[PDB]
Amino acid sequence: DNRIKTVVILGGGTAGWMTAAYLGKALQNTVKIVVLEAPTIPRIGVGEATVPNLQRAFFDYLGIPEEEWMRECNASYKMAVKFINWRTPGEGSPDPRTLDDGHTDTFHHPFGLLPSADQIPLSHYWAAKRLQGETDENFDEACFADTAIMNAKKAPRFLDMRRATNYAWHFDASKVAAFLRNFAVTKQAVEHVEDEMTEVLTDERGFITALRTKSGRILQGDLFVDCSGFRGLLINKAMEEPFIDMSDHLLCNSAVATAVPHDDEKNGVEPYTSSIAMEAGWTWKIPMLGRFGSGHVYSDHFATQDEATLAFSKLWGLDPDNTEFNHVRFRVGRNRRAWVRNCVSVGLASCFVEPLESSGIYFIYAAIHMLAKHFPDKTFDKVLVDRFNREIEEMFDDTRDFLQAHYYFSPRVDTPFWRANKELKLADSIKDKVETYRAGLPVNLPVTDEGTYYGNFEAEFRNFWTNGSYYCIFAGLGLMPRNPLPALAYKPQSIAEAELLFADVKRKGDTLVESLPSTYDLLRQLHG
Ligand SMILES: N[C@@H](Cc1c[nH]c2ccccc12)C(=O)O
Numbered sequence: 211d212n213r214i215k216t217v218v219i220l221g222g223g224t225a226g227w228m229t230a231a232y233l234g235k236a237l238q239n240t241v242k243i244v245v246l247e248a249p250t251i252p253r254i255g256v257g258e259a260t261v262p263n264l265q266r267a268f269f270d271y272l273g274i275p276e277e278e279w280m281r282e283c284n285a286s287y288k289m290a291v292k293f294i295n296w297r298t299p300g301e302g303s304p305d306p307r308t309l310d311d312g313h314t315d316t317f318h319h320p321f322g323l324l325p326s327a328d329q330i331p332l333s334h335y336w337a338a339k340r341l342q343g344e345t346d347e348n349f350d351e352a353c354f355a356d357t358a359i360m361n362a363k364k365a366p367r368f369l370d371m372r373r374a375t376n377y378a379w380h381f382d383a384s385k386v387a388a389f390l391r392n393f394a395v396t397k398q399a400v401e402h403v404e405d406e407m408t409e410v411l412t413d414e415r416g417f418i419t420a421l422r423t424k425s426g427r428i429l430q431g432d433l434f435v436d437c438s439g440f441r442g443l444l445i446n447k448a449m450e451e452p453f454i455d456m457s458d459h460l461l462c463n464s465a466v467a468t469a470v471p472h473d474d475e476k477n478g479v480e481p482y483t484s485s486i487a488m489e490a491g492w493t494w495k496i497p498m499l500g501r502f503g504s505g506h507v508y509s510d511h512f513a514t515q516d517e518a519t520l521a522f523s524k525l526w527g528l529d530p531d532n533t534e535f536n537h538v539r540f541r542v543g544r545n546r547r548a549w550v551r552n553c554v555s556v557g558l559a560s561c562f563v564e565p566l567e568s569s570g571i572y573f574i575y576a577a578i579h580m581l582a583k584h585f586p587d588k589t590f591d592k593v594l595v596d597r598f599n600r601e602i603e604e605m606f607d608d609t610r611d612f613l614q615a616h617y618y619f620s621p622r623v624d625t626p627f628w629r630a631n632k633e634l635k636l637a638d639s640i641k642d643k644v645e646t647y648r649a650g651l652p653v654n655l656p657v658t659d660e661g662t663y664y665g666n667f668e669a670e671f672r673n674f675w676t677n678g679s680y681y682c683i684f685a686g687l688g689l690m691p692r693n694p695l696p697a698l699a700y701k702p703q704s705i706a707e708a709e710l711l712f713a714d715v716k717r718k719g720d721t722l723v724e725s726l727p728s729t730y731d732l733l734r735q736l737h738g
């Protein structure tokens with residue numbers, strides 16, 4: 211019997227407690243699971259955003275109903291990330307400026323998959339019309355009914371909880387953590403040890419045998435999961451695995467954040483996350499129940515903590531002398547390997563990017579998912595570890611490339627930050643995709659319906675940023691194909707078919723704006 215008998219997880223928060231809860235279920239009570247979590251002074255909830263797979267892939271697997279966890283964590287609803295002022299120069303403002311062409315400088319990145327006609331995504335029909343002056347509609351409004359719903363701040367479900375669209379979640383991460391801790395301990399026989407780690411004990415081959423706590427207690431184990439955050443106490447310090455810094459792709463490295471009380475009854479609640487462009491980065495806005503989380507992500511090469519804190523306060527008209535701010539310095543990049551010997555990194559300790567496209571919890575989920583599938587025995591087969599490592603690095607680099615694209619193809623050059631972004635080099639694979647897009651071809655074409663895509667994690671994992679997401683961002687920022695897909699010039703029936711799709715999107719949006727409750731009302735209904 212060469213089986214792992216004990217798993218020790220260093221660190222709590224979302225990474226630790228998602229890991230504990232997930233492996234709790236996956237390992238079917240054959241393995242003891244211990245979490246060693248430093249107790250800390252609970253910081254203010256600056257808000258986290260997620261992607262739609264979270265309920266099916268994670269909470270449904272644990273048997274936790276959506277309303278149960280949402281009610282505990284003050285969760286709200288997300289239908290997109292909405293980008294504001296990424297094309298126009300100026301001070302940071304919550305209000306969108308106007309483009310040269312008269313359009314408002316906003317664009318959406320909603321969920322779901324684009325419909326197709328004659329096996330060609332709606333995006334391409336839109337682009338054919340836009341390039342030839344047959345439409346002045348933006349890509350997002352023409353191709354996603356969700357755009358209309360969001361503009362009127364309506365909910366993704368009706369008041370009887372009938373689904374109208376795809377959505378994900380906004381929530382306070384520490385609340386989800388507390389909830390999962392509670393779940394894992396009471397329901398799954400996970401042991402919680404509230405203490406700090408002082409020693410990492412290793413055998414002759416450099417495999418971890420145990421952690422010592424600050425109280426002297428030794429926690430023996432066979433597999434160790436590093437959820438220690440940015441310090442990477444196991445993977446980087448103890449195992450000495452180098453972190454690959456990727457600040458030559460993404461300049462932002464700091465954040466200042468707070469929670470802002472909000473008159474929901476008065477203003478409504480946005481069913482989306484906003485990315486508000488600033489002079490030296492951007493600011494998130496994550497509406498929750500009664501408050502929104504916000505954080506100004508910035509490069510400290512281009513702004514001091516005071517400068518950034520001042521500009522951020524100014525967005526919302528905060529008193530910086532009378533406001534509670536969390537300041538964070540980020541690691542941006544990933545370990546050379548996520549898993550070395552019998553030490554597996556998950557979360558911040560593995561890798562990180564700014565939450566520009568809500569990567570944080572997805573990255574955690576993907577790791578634990580891949581860990582359960584690549585779960586080892588005590589012989590730690592080199593191939594098993596290698597394939598796991600391979601998935602994390604492809605996952606990471608791919609999302610990295612996608613985020614750089616947001617900065618690289620921004621037309622802004624008004625501050626040294628925005629100028630500096632146009633000096634960085636793109637990786638080959640995102641260059642390749644830009645080339646493909648620009649010839650009018652789809653990038654990462656969806657080959658699946660939504661049911662399959664959001665019902666089977668592995669389907670989404672192999673095609674995470676689809677053609678639709680590429681169109682949302684490139685087109686959103688003003689990057690268009692050089693020309694339409696040439697096949698379209700030969701396909702009048704197919705063009706007619708696409709007109710019907712365009713009309714279905716208008717009709718759905720109009721009908722659903724008319725009949726849907728406000729996001730605000732749906733929240734009241736849910737949290738009553
Ligand atoms: N795989 C994600 C892609 C996605 C689309 N829009 C997004 C906005 C934010 C983050 C991710 C996304 C999904 O379909 O859910």
Ligand SMILES: [K+]
Nearest residue numbers: 418419431432
């Ligand atoms: K051991």
